[PDB]
DNA sequence: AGGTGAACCTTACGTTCAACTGGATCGTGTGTAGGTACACCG
DNA sequence: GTCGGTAAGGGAGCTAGTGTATGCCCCTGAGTTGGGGATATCGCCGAC
C-alpha cells in the first residue's frame, strides 16, 4: 500500500537548521526499512520503547519525522533524559520516547569551504526548552543586569550562532544529518508498517 | 551537462593588469566554491585561488599571494579573477573548476579553460 | 608538493599501481585525496572521488586506496586509451590545495 | 597599497556552578585582520 | 579394509536479501558505527 515518502526526507536537498528544525507527518504508507541502508554511511542507528527486531510486525496512529543538522560530538545530546546546548535550547526530547534518531555524516556535501553559514543553532536561552518545542525568535539576549534595548552589543549577544562548518573540520566536528522518527500511537487506526 | 567559458587573455606585457572571466551555467553557482588553478607549458598543475560559496573568504596560493584577486558575482553568474604585476614565469593554461555536490573539498567540473602568455615581445 | 613517480609504464591486461607520498598534513593525517586523469591537451577530470570512492560515469577499473600515509590508484585491465597523465590531489591545513605533480602511463605498443 | 587608531563576540575549542570586574588578559585556556582606507607622485 | 585428523568445534570478520561455520550484523552499542562468544551434526581426503 503505497510506500512511505522516506526519499523525500533523506534525499531532501537541504536540512533546516537544529534551531527550525522541521516535521513531516509519515502515515498511509508502509516503513521499508530495508532501502533506508545504502545511503551514505550511517553514524548512529539506535531505537528506545521498540525492539528494531520486530519493527515490521507493528504499526502506529502515526510517526513525525523531525530532520536537521549537528556537529558529531553534538549527537549524543540527541537522546531522552540527554544535557547539553541542543537538549536545552534547540531540540529537546521526552524522556518516554516512543521512536528513534538516524544519523549519517554529510561532510562531503554539507560542508562549504570557508564555513557554511548557512546552519545556525542556539548559543543562549533564558529558559531550558520543553519537549517537542520549537524557538525561532531572534531577540537579544541579555546576560547582565544591564537592558540592551535589543542593540547587540556589550553583555547583549545574538542568541544565534552559525555552524563553521568546514572540509579541515574534526573527526566529530563534521556535519550530520539527524532525522529522528517519533512513533505516535493512540485508540485509531494504525497507519505504517511495512511487510509481515 | 554544464558548461564553464573563460573569457582569456592574449599575450600581455609583464607587470600589467588583467581580468579573467569564467561563465558557468547548468549548475547552481551560488552554492559552492569556484577554484582557479593554472598549468605551465608542458608542467604539472598547481592551485591557484579558491573562493567561498559567497565570496566572504578567499584563498591564494603563497605564489600569487598579494598580487592576485579572485571575486565573483552571483547576480549574472561569474567569476573574476584580477591578476596584477605579472611576471614572465606566471605563463600558463588557467582552469575554473567548480567543486560540484557531493565534495567541495576537491575540483570535479574542471572548463575548458584559457591561456595567458606572459612575455615581453610583440 | 607531493611526490610521484615519473613514468610508469606497463603491457596492456595487467593490474599497474600508481603511488604518491606526502608529510603527515596532507593525505596522513586528512584522508581528503582524489586524482585526476588529464589527457593530452584536454581538461582534466575527476576519476578517483575522494580517499576510496568514484563519481558516476567513470570507469569501474580504477580503484583508489590508502596505506597510512601514502595513496594509491590501481588499474586494471588497462587499455590503449588509458595513456595520459594522472595527478594525485590532496586538502591540506590552511586550505593549500597541494597537487601531485607528474605521472604519466604508456602502453606497449 | 601600509602605518598608527577602536574594536564587533571577534568565530571555530581542548570541557560545565557563572559571568564579560566591565584591562587584552580576566577566575579556565582566547586573540587576532581587515580596513571606512583619500595624497603620494601616479 | 576400519579409525583419527580436519585453515574445527573454537579463531576471526563484517553489510541485508536469506546459509549453513571465509556464515549469521546472531545478538546492539563510545556513537567515531560495532564488542566478543552462543549447540556443534558430520560427511571428507588420505595413512594405515
Ligand atoms: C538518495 O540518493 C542516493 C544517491 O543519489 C540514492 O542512491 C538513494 O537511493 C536515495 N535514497 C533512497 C532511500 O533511495
Known amino acids: 500500500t503505497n510506500l512511505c515518502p522516506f526519499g523525500e526526507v533523506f534525499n531532501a536537498t537541504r536540512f533546516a537548521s537544529v534551531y527550525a528544525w522541521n516535521r513531516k507527518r509519515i502515515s498511509n504508507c508502509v516503513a521499508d526499512y530495508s532501502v533506508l541502508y545504502n545511503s551514505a554511511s550511517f553514524s548512529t542507528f539506535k531505537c528506545y520503547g521498540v525492539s528494531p527486531t520486530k519493527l515490521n510486525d507493528l504499526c502506529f496512529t502515526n510517526v513525525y519525522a523531525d530532520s536537521f543538522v549537528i556537529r558529531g560530538d553534538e549527537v549524543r545530546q540527541i537522546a531522552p533524559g540527554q544535557t547539553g546546548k541542543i537538549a536545552d535550547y534547540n531540540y529537546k526530547l521526552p524522556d518516554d520516547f516512543t521512536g528513534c534518531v538516524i544519523a549519517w555524516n554529510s561532510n562531503n556535501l554539507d560542508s562549504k569551504v570557508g564555513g557554511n553559514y548557512n546552519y545556525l543553532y542556539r548559543l543562549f536561552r533564558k529558559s531550558n526548552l520543553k519537549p517537542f518545542e520549537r524557538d525561532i525568535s531572534t531577540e537579544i539576549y541579555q546576560a547582565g543586569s544591564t537592558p540592551c534595548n535589543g542593540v547587540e552589543g556589550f553583555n547583549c549577544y545574538f542568541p544565534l550562532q552559525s555552524y563553521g562548518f568546514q572540509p579541515t573540520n574534526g573527526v566529530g566536528y563534521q556535519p550530520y544529518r539527524v532525522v529522528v522518527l517519533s512513533f505516535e500511537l493512540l485508540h485509531a487506526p494504525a497507519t505504517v508498517c511495512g511487510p509481515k | 551537462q554544464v558548461q564553464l567559458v573563460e573569457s582569456g587573455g592574449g599575450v600581455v606585457q609583464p607587470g600589467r593588469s588583467l581580468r579573467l572571466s569564467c561563465a558557468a551555467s547548468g549548475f547552481t553557482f551560488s552554492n559552492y566554491a569556484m577554484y582557479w588553478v593554472r598549468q605551465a607549458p608542458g608542467k604539472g598543475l598547481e592551485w591557484v585561488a579558491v573562493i567561498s560559496y559567497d565570496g566572504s573568504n578567499k584563498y591564494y596560493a603563497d605564489s600569487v599571494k598579494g598580487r592576485f584577486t579572485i571575486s565573483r558575482d552571483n547576480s549574472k553568474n561569474t567569476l573574476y579573477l584580477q591578476m596584477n604585476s605579472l611576471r614572465t614565469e606566471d605563463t600558463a593554461v588557467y582552469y575554473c573548476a567548480s567543486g560540484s555536490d557531493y565534495g567541495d573539498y576537491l575540483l570535479v567540473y574542471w572548463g575548458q579553460g584559457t591561456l595567458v602568455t606572459v612575455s615581453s615581445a610583440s | ?109
Open chain 3, 1 to 109: 608538493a607531493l611526490t610521484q613517480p615519473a613514468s610508469v609504464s606497463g603491457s596492456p591486461g595487467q593490474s599497474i599501481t600508481i603511488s604518491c607520498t606526502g608529510t603527515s598534513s596532507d593525505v596522513g593525517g586528512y584522508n581528503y585525496v582524489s586524482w585526476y586523469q588529464q589527457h593530452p591537451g584536454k581538461a582534466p577530470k575527476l576519476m578517483i572521488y575522494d580517499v576510496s570512492k568514484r563519481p558516476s560515469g567513470v570507469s569501474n577499473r580504477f580503484s583508489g586506496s590508502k596505506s597510512g600515509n601514502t595513496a594509491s590508484l590501481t588499474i586494471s585491465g588497462l587499455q590503449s586509451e588509458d595513456e595520459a597523465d594522472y595527478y594525485c590531489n590532496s586538502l591540506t591545513s590552511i586550505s593549500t590545495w597541494v597537487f601531485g605533480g607528474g605521472t604519466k602511463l604508456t602502453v606497449l605498443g
